[PDB]
Every structure is written in structure tokens, then in C-alpha cells.
Design a protein around this nucleic acid. Structure first.
Lengths: 296, 296
DNA sequence: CAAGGGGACTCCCCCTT
DNA sequence: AAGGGGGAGTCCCCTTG
């Protein structure tokens, strides 16, 4: 069961909106916010130790998106942080919640990746033999690095919180179970981010369809994009906008013809939803309302 | 025109649509077309020697956009061309026209600009002293390069045709006047492309204006773009679209409200033009028609 | 391949406060 | 400067023939 002391993520990071920064760009470009942040009501990743009150140390580090949680080529930078990418905070005996309001992600160069990665692999399995390392092991350490650089997603990271309860000594030597956050996408990384409908020229139509709408959106590859018109309650009607890739303008607009509603001769207007859908994927835009009107 | 023999550009290069290629990208990415090219009917830069029939040699090279024509950091690459960027063709005594259907522009790196530059300058003022060069002159040769690299536009080039009449010897040793073409813009270079109206949602209105139009365009700068609605008669009637920069969507759409026509209570619809205008500049889109209708 | 095109990786900036 | 953002280089790739 839960019974023993455990860490819990009180407020997860934003899965979508964060830009990873390269070494060149700067260290002061803004902190990884919470999933609940708004331009004014800002929130930061928070975690809490439950089933214990007292002095404690929580540390965060970047791990892979892969279930087997291996350390990431990327490093966390900030006021609280080590050079190895490890951020450490102290919870007072009163307040067992730790906020991380200044977390940045240093984006490793593909020319950098292996050296930066063996450095980490060293630091990590050098306490396993603290005097030195064998060439045999250093050959095989480079072997992990290589096989990891071939599969490693540099667009997606996960925060890993490792909580440590300070003992009687003064030593923060007791471990808790490590808690991994949900994935974090690089917003300035290849597409597949948050589909957005900025505005559309019409929000209404006849039940017949064929009415041409100009839809302004965030970047949508002609390849992977549709215009899904659906009702959710009513056993899920679904139909699509009538557009050729030529009709998707510089990946920021769609000129499409509305589809007909499933049931003609409706006595009165029927409100439906439309949304962007990646057919290749399954992601969706924030859906807007559309009204279908009756005939003559 | 000069009585003596002279070159004339029969068909100029396309001022607008050509991409300059970097060394990495490839050598086979398409030839600099004529100002008259279409996707069916393709045309290439052509020049002719007039006021002479016989064997002759025409060579093309890239010169600065600056009126005093200096050799450009960029080089011409192709089937006909030298490593120094100089393309050479031979006109037989019958046909005194030279077509250049395979001209590419190698785009120099900013890290390689000075070296590539001193190389064409050595080549150029090494025939002025063909045994060697003085360090003093090589100090001052580097001085030309430096002062040129400060002011050189790497987005704009001009073709320079140098025609040479073969003499009795067999030597193509007689010069004609060199003819410089109109400027050639890098299409994949910063801003300053052709304002284009892709499509608009409405082409019509009431004389009253205030009708909202969604216009899809090529990239425009939010601050320094406008929507000029004008009548061709030098009466000048001109007015503008109504929109905030917020209304210019990801620089590829404009949502604006039509202006009122100058003269209300017309009894017949009046056709006007609208166009994009850079107010900062004076560059215009290809203008589309708009119809103003009467009231109630 | 030729003849086009489009879209990442690293970096370099600018507006706002 | 802290806390956002878009732009620009050079490159590394895709359409159709």
C-alpha cells in the first residue's frame, strides 16, 4: 500500500508550452511553469512529501520519455541547480511542499550530445567504484551512450523528483520513492504542438453544407490536418471539411467548404462543434461551435 | 545607340523569384529563368551582339547592386562556368544571341566571404602584374575586401555580360561595352518579397463599408502594411482597410473592415480596386477588384 | 538524377517589464 | 537584466519527372 512516506506531484509541469534553450541563447529566458499557469496567475511545478513532517531535500533532474527512466542529455539550469543538471531544494519541517519556479532546460547540441552524455554516465557510475574506472567499463560506458544517442528524443523530457529525508545525523541520507512527471514537449521543436483556431470567417451555415469558411490557425502541415465536425452526446456524428492541401494556405489558414449535417429537414437550428484533427495523429484543436440552419 | 558593336539584353533575368543556393544544398537546383518565364513556356536570360556578325565570346559574372559595379562575393555555377564564377559562351557567325539556361548563384557563407572575396580580387588584379604581387598591394587588396564586406548586399546581385569579338589571330581579344542587367533578389532572403493576394473571403460590400474581409497573403509586416482601395482615374479616390496589427494573423492573413466609398447614394454598383501597400515602402500587391453596392 | 520546394537545428536578436 | 517572442543563417532534406 501507500503506508510509508512518499512524494507526490502537487502541480505538474506544462506538457506543451515550454521552450528549451540552447547554451548560446541565455540562462535567463523564463522558468518551466505549471500545467495551471496563466499570464497573470503563474504556477510552477510543485511536489509534496506526505506521511512525514521534518527536514527533507528534494532534487529534480531530466530523464527520458521512455518508461525505463534513464538520465537525459539535457540539463536543468537555474538558481537552485548543479552543473550536472540536478536541482535541489530543502523543505522545512512545517511546509513539506517544494515549488520549482526557476527551472530551465539547456538544449544539448547534436555535436555535443555524446561527450555531454558520457560525462553524466561517468558521474553516475563513478560512486559504484570511487577510486577509478576500468578501460573495459569505459569502452562499455561509451557503448550505452552510443545506443542511447540513436533513440533519444531531444524534444521530450520528464522531471524526476528524488526526495531525501534528513536523518538524526544531519545527513539527508534517507531515500523516498522517485516520482516521474508527465512528458514535457519542446515548444520550439518539430510541430505536433497545440492546434489552435485563431478565428474563422463564418460560424454558421445551412444544413446542406458546401459553405466556404476561411479558418485562421497555428501552423498545420497540409499533410496532417482535417476539420472534424462532431456532436459528442448524440452517439458521435462526425464529418469533415472539404479541402485540398492547396486550400491550406502557408500552413496558417484553411479555406474549406462545410460538410452537410447528418439529418436534413431539421425544424430549427442545430449547434455542432468543429475542430482541427491530425488524421495521422489524434490530437485536436480547442473546438468552436457552428450552427446549421434549416432549408429555404 | 553607339554606332560601334554593342551587347543588348534580349531577355532580362527574373528580378523576383530566384533562390540563391549555398554550397551544401546542391548544384542542380534549377536555372536562373527569364523575366518572361512561365511553368509551361520557360525563358532564360538572353543577350545579343548587334552591329556585328562573326565568332564571339560572351561571359557573365555577378556584380554588386551598387551602381559602381564591383565583383560580388557570390559565384555563378553551371555547365558553362569557371570556378571563379565566370560563365562563357560562344556565338557562331550566324547566330549572335547567347542564351544562359543553366545559371545558378552559389551563396557565400559569412565565415567564408572575405577569403572568397580576396580570391576573386587576386584573380582580377594578378593579370595587371602576372608574375607576382607586392605585400603592399596585398595589404591594400585586403583593404578593398574589408570595406566591401561592410556594405555588400548578399540578397541582391546583377548579371554582367562582357562580350568579346574574336580577332583575325584566333584570340577572342576584342572587348565590347559591358552590359549590366537589372537587380536579382534572393527569394529565400529576408523579407522584401512580392506582396501577393492569395484569396479573400469577400469581393463585395455596401457603399457604407465596415464589412469584414479575411484576406490571405504572402508574409507581411504587421506595422507597415495597409489595404489601399483606390480608383484608377487620377481623381485619386483612395481609402484604407480598418484593422489593428492584432488583426494581421501570423503575417499570412489580414482580417479587416472595408472602408466606405467616397460617394454614397449611387444607384448602380461601382467597381474599385484594392491592393496591399507597404506604407513604409511603396511596393504594391497585384490589385483585385471590389464591388460597392447601393443602400436598402 | 534535374527542377523545384519546404522545414528543421543552432543562434541571434526584439519587445516588454 | 528577467521573461517572453520571432527572425535570421546555413543546412538537410521532401515533392513530381
Amino acid at each position: 500500500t501507500a503506508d510509508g512516506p512518499y512524494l507526490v506531484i502537487v502541480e505538474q509541469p506544462k506538457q506543451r508550452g515550454f521552450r528549451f534553450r540552447y547554451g548560446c541563447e541565455g540562462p535567463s529566458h523564463g522558468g518551466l511553469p505549471g500545467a495551471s499557469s496563466e499570464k497573470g496567475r503563474k504556477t510552477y511545478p510543485t511536489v509534496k512529501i506526505c506521511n512525514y513532517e521534518g527536514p527533507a531535500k528534494i532534487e529534480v533532474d531530466l530523464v527520458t520519455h521512455s518508461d525505463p527512466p534513464r538520465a537525459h542529455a539535457h540539463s536543468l539550469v537555474g538558481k537552485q541547480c548543479s552543473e550536472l543538471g540536478i536541482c535541489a531544494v530543502s523543505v522545512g519541517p512545517k511546509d513539506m511542499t517544494a515549488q520549482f519556479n526557476n527551472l530551465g532546460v539547456l538544449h544539448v547540441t547534436k555535436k555535443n550530445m555524446m561527450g555531454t552524455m558520457i560525462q553524466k554516465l561517468q558521474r553516475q557510475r563513478l560512486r559504484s567504484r570511487p577510486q577509478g574506472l576500468t578501460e573495459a567499463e569505459q569502452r562499455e560506458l561509451e557503448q550505452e551512450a552510443k545506443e542511447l544517442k540513436k533513440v533519444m528524443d531531444l524534444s521530450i523530457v520528464r522531471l524526476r523528483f528524488s526526495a531525501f529525508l534528513r536523518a538524526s545525523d544531519g545527513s539527508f541520507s534517507l531515500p523516498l520513492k522517485p516520482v516521474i512527471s508527465q512528458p514535457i514537449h519542446d515548444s520550439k521543436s518539430p510541430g505536433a504542438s497545440n492546434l489552435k483556431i485563431s478565428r474563422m470567417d463564418k460560424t454558421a451555415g445551412s444544413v446542406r453544407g458546401g459553405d466556404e469558411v476561411y479558418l485562421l490557425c497555428d501552423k498545420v502541415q497540409k499533410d496532417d490536418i482535417e476539420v472534424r465536425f462532431y456532436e459528442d452526446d448524440e452517439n458521435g456524428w462526425q464529418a469533415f471539411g472539404d479541402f485540398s492541401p492547396t486550400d491550406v494556405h502557408k500552413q496558417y489558414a484553411i479555406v474549406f467548404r462545410t460538410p452537410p449535417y447528418h439529418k436534413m429537414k431539421i425544424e430549427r437550428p442545430v449547434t455542432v462543434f468543429l475542430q482541427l484533427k491530425r488524421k495521422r495523429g489524434g490530437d485536436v484543436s480547442d473546438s468552436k461551435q457552428f450552427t446549421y440552419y434549416p432549408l429555404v
